[PDB]
Amino acid sequence: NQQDFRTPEFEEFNGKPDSLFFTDGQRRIDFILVYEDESKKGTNEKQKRKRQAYESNLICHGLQLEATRSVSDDKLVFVKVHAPWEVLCTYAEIMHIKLPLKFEKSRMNDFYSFFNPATRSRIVYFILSRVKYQVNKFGINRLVSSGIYKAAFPLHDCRFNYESEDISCPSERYLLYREWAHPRSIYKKQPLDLIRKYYGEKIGIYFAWLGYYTQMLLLAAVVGVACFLYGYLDQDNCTWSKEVCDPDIGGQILMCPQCDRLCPFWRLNITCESSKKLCIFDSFGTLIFAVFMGVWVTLFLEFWKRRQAELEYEWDTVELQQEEQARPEYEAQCTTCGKCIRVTLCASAVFFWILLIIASVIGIIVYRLSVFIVFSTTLTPQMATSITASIISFIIIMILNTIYEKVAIMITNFELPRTQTDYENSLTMKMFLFQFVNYYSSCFYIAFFKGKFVGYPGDPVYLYRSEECDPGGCLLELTTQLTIIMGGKAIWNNIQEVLLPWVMNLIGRYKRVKITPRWEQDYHLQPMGKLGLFYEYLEMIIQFGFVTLFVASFPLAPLLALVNNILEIRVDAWKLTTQFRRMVPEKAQDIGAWQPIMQGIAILAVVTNAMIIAFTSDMIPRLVYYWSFSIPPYGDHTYYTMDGYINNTLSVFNITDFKNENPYIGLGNYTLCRYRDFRNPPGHPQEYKHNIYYWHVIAAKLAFIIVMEHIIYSVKFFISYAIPDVSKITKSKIKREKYLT
Amino acid sequence: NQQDFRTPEFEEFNGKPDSLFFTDGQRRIDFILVYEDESKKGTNEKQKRKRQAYESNLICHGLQLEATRSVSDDKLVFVKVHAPWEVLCTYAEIMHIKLPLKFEKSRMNDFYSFFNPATRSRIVYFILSRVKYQVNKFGINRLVSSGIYKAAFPLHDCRFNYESEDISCPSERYLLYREWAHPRSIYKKQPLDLIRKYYGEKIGIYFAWLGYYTQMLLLAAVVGVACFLYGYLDQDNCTWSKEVCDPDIGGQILMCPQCDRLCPFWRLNITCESSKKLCIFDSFGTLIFAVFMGVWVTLFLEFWKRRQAELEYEWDTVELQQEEQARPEYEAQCTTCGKCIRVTLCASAVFFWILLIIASVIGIIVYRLSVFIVFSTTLTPQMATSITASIISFIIIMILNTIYEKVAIMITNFELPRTQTDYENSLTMKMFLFQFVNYYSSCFYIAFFKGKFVGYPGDPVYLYRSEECDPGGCLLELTTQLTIIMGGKAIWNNIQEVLLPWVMNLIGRYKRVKITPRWEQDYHLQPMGKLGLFYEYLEMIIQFGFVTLFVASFPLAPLLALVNNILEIRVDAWKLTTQFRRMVPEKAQDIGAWQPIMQGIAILAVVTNAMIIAFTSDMIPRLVYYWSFSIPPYGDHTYYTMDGYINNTLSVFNITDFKNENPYIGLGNYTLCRYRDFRNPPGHPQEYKHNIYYWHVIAAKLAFIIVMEHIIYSVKFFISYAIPDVSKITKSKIKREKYLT
Ligand SMILES: CCCCCCCCCC(=O)OC[C@@H](COP(=O)(O)OCC[N+](C)(C)C)OC(=O)CCCCCCCCC
Ligand SMILES: CCCCCCCCCC(=O)OC[C@@H](COP(=O)(O)OCC[N+](C)(C)C)OC(=O)CCCCCCCCC
Ligand SMILES: [Ca+2]
Ligand SMILES: [Ca+2]
Ligand SMILES: [Ca+2]
Ligand SMILES: [Ca+2]
Ligand SMILES: [Ca+2]
Ligand SMILES: [Ca+2]
């Protein structure tokens, strides 16, 4: 309970380059602790006065220790930590570690190299986190947080590129870099048993979920490519876009300008080329695919629950939850009624920053309104404006993402969560709320609030002059924004994931921190951090959002995400194998709070896809025209047909601007221009009021939302009721375990 | 393992009228078995050849037995079953019965009259169901099913009216009849600990759920009486019903007749009186109350989850689930692939009977259409028709209810569920599906499909001549139908619950099956059955439906259900205390499949209330008139006002019937009559087509459904997220148990 004997068989050794064992070769290295002492203001001795109080207690609890001085830094001392078999047995009786039995699997010790190095490192981390050093001081994480211990980590097995010098050691890192974690192995399956055996259940459940997500994205992408190619093969039979591109019809439709000054009266032919690709993006193929994706997200979640029950059997992820260690920052600071008011102030700060990113979207709006004029002066101006605004908004999103990463850490540190699980849950909800709003607010704007409230040419909506949409619809602008944000997020995040740990290791080598042992090799690496795969999970969840919430705009979002996921498995595996220091293995039975987040996104996606097809697509006005306004009482044709749709949908405007400016008489010499709204013609008794066709179309839009939402929610309820959550073979395996034991 | 010694210390005793102990007075009666043998075709001896094979094994497993002949029937033999302390201890070590500890509560035996008579009867029923008699024959339920044993039951404590003759015995039935189960005690609280102590966890959880449901119905009824009285106090300020009742305005509106022959052109004044009470039933009070009830059902379900976690602590309902005994009818009959096709045939028969009750509703439609003419010949005819049709449809519902009780038993017996829990789950889903459709199909018809598809006077919808609705709306017809069905179901079911076990006991006394002991007194009672409180639960769930799905029609459904529940607690408790034989206590941690059923009804109720307010109420056309058609572009008034609504909503019809009959020229000499639809006037370019006001109103109806559904579902999601499922004091009690143990 005191500091008398430390660091036994302390000697400097450098003879073996690749040895996971001690200098004697009897016992292996379960952990490495790293400190320095030899080089003010009374801080040094005081840490020496505390650090030894830890280490001696480690041998009073049974652990074997042995240090060597570092060969590069004379201050750095590497302490190898090993657990004897008796200490392993008692601290594996405390935590019910499930071992093979004669492979039947049961509690604290079973009948049968017995303990893998992964579960050995888990045992020694439990021991390292429990032992008291001292007021009451709890564990090792407080020492590493307080600058006492520089680094504590388990060792990797070998070099990832070269086979280990030991003949008895299985080169787990090398064989996991050859058959995984390498772009040479992009086609091969994932050795999920091997990656959990090397890494742990958190890493194994992330890569199992990522491989399953990629497999289901392959199905969604095949059906989406089928629907997109159905639109591409019916591209030549679209009546409305051919009528747009015809100069005898679509050329004559002279449109009103959108902004007040320095915007010309434009003919509809400049829409024409975009209109062609627009016929692929709101056809019946994207509607059928939106209904299919409403079914597919439920198949995804139900078969993930089945795969997760399969892994809860196969991997023994359901372990008894020991009482969790409190975080050191909580117990250092140590009423509850005031902590509640601190939490409310924290929530108000979070909603302040959410409203800041809303103001950033308002700034993007004002940018588009200012830059459309100068793009019309200096590939139509609105399409060029939309592509460059997508580029600029993606850059602003990536800039504000890092700033919220930092301030989300600060915001979650200001409130004090006692446990790491409560910390991660609060950070998960807060960080996802910002990433949701930050990544999808521009897309939700272009979908639901862009062009909807503009009014007619006389009396437009002034905030100044909210953005008017294209005659085809803002679906093409949404598709371009989605493609830019999704593909650029994939490319930029993969480039950052490749470079940033690699660049940090490179600058460490250049700061010079020839033959060298395993602990120095692993110490010159990047640590993952207390978060872990948080961000990894976050990224994919964002991608899931982009796949599901916005799938009615373009059906190639599963294909884009599938290409990204096929790259992402390898880039995550490569960085975790080579560039990162080895994490202690943990145990996780699910992906965490991300699964409630995904079920919430699945519920929201039905509403969002119905509102996309109704409001930002132009499928419902086309459908209503064909079925109701080409018949005799409202139209001239005898049978249902789609010709004359563009001439009979756009509304005429005589140049009568209200005197509450009158810009059109300066911008042109024309007297009548057509705009995209369904208001009455001039000279009506109710001129420029909403007409019978508008109210018919908006009733069909709302009836479509109602019918599609209720039908899809009922089909999702029936599919979730029909598919059992646990698989039949997994029930049989659990029943066979209960039968034998 | 064989039949050698049976029925020890067998003697006829009649000296003690009220003795729960044996003739010696040492040991108590845990069970009573009842058989008869002494009075063909070889059946008698064969049952004698089997019955003894049971009883001897009972003493080979340790139970003590003692029979007396009955004093009334010389054939009847009553066998008293007692468990010794050692047998109680071993079979309470098999099933982890939780006893007080020094009241801390833990497993198989604890430190401390020790076993209550309830848990003693539960132990002896476990023993009675496990012991083999014999091919393999399992337990006692097979003997009672096969006519071997006439009756097996635990004894009640005393007479319910009179205190027990024993001085040591607590008169549990009498004290539970004095402070509960008696209309004298209608105001008092429920002794929930005492009723679980006497009866078991299934009965205690039903009465805890019923008392909690009554308490929450008190809150819902107070707010509903507030909203109804707000409508009753604003009854004199309704502009539209006053305009209906005014003979200068509402008298002049001469309406078209509904059916083809023998129905007169009627003025709107005959609606007038109904219109007054109609102003209480679609006001803003019922709208505010519908939003409040969408919140209240979620508060109900969340606080039931909190009360249920409170009872899972306080009552020890979470016991280890022993492997359930298979049902005797399954194991008697004993491939699985053919059993699947039997299940599909069973499902097809169920949907055949559901479509039969749909045809019964179609017959009710044809009845109304036939009887409105003769009610117009022989209190307007449509209101008299609606009240008598509610009476006749309620009688037909009560007639078809019993028929489906019988055929649902037959349908669930045709498929073969192996376990009683799977049997009850399948019967719960099938029986609720029929009770749902049977009780609410007439109400859903009057709400959503009555008067909606009728067409204009020219070209009406012929099936013949689907029913036309009233100018105020079919909400008053729905309110009358709901009040009749709900109040009559309450009154009739309470009268049946009072009489039917009481009448069966009375006819048993009259068939004569003076001083008599406890086992004969309890044998001359009605057994509850293998179902138990199934039907009780069913009834209340139906009531819940009537409270929540249809709450927008009338706000006094919580008050009607609250009066019914205050009566229902006492009538259920009274019949279970006095008229029914004592059930063995069981263990239930929740109400069962009824809680998924209630969550489904809660989800459906939001949709149903939104569609009631939009479609079968007339609030949205009134609101659209006030906000949009009394302004200058569509109306004459300068400010928003509701006068002229009745004259400007109903549509004119010149008598131009299509020649595809022309009944109106025979039924009257009038040339123009007004009907309830929003079609264009005659002489229009689009005459009798739907107009701008119709499409405006239907767009507001669908936008109201969308806004109300999404707002209420979001508020319900936020309330379910904010309210934690387990209570804070209950977390503290569970943590204190984990702290002490
Ligand atoms: C909760 C997750 C997603 C929420 C997104 C909300 C969507 C809001 C968009 C919206 O309602 O737009 C208002 C109009 C749209 O009619 P449009 O004809 O698109 O407006 C004119 C556009 N044009 C001049 C270019 C021809 O539509 C109406 O006037 C009918 C109002 C019904 C909207 C209710 C939806 C959600 C309420 C919670
Ligand atoms: C799932 C649980 C409950 C389901 C109940 C479904 C409700 C069906 C009722 C319905 O849609 O009615 C059709 C019309 C109603 O317009 P009204 O103006 O009431 O019809 C004329 C009536 N009048 C002659 C006396 C003036 O409305 C329309 O034409 C718009 C159609 C939108 C209906 C979609 C709702 C549910 C779809 C799954
Ligand atoms: Ca990435
Ligand atoms: Ca990643
Ligand atoms: Ca499921
Ligand atoms: Ca009743
Ligand atoms: Ca009842
Ligand atoms: Ca909750």
Numbering used by the authors:
A (entry chain A), B (entry chain B): 43 to 81, 87 to 149, 187 to 196, 202 to 223, 228 to 427, 445 to 488, 503 to 587, 591 to 640, ...
Question: What did the authors write?
Answer:
In platelets, scrambling is mediated by the protein TMEM16F, which catalyzes the externalization of phosphatidylserine (PS) in response to an increase in the intracellular Ca2+ concentration to trigger blood clotting. TMEM16F belongs to the TMEM16 protein family, whose members either function as Ca2+ activated anion-selective channels or as Ca2+ activated lipid scramblases. To better understand how the small sequence differences in TMEM16F give rise to its distinct functional properties, we determined the structure of murine TMEM16F (mTMEM16F) by cryo-EM in Ca2+-bound and Ca2+-free states, both in a detergent and in a lipid environment. By combining data from cryo-electron microscopy, in vitro scrambling assays and electrophysiology, our study has provided insight into the diverse functional behavior of mTMEM16F, a member of the TMEM16 family that facilitates the transport of lipids and ions across cellular membranes. Both processes are controlled by the binding of Ca2+ to a site located within the transmembrane domain that is accessible from the cytoplasm and they are mediated by the same structural element located at the periphery of each subunit.
For that purpose, we determined structures of mTMEM16F in the absence and presence of Ca2+. Structures of the protein in the detergent digitonin were determined for Ca2+-bound and Ca2+-free states by cryo-EM at 3.2 Å and 3.6 Å, respectively. The structure of mTMEM16F in the presence of Ca2+ defines the location of two Ca2+ ions in each subunit that are bound to a site which strongly resembles its counterpart in nhTMEM16 and mTMEM16A. In this site, conserved acidic and polar residues located on α-helices 6–8 coordinate the ions with similar geometry. In the presence of Ca2+, the bound ligands provide an interaction platform for negatively charged and polar residues on α6, thereby immobilizing the helix in the observed conformation. The structure of the putative catalytic unit of mTMEM16F in a Ca2+-bound conformation shows a strong resemblance to the ion permeation path in mTMEM16A, where an hourglass-shaped pore contains two aqueous vestibules on either side of the membrane that are bridged by a narrow neck. A related architecture is observed in mTMEM16F, where closer interactions between α-helices and the presence of bulky residues along the path further constrict the pore below the size of permeating ions. Further towards the cytoplasm, the bulky Tyr 563 lowers the pore diameter of mTMEM16F to 1.6 Å. In the case of Ca2+-bound structures, the relationship of mTMEM16F to the intermediate conformation of nhTMEM16 observed in nanodiscs is, with an RMSD of 1.9 Å, much closer than to the open conformation of the same protein, where the RMSD of 3.1 Å underlines their nonequivalence.
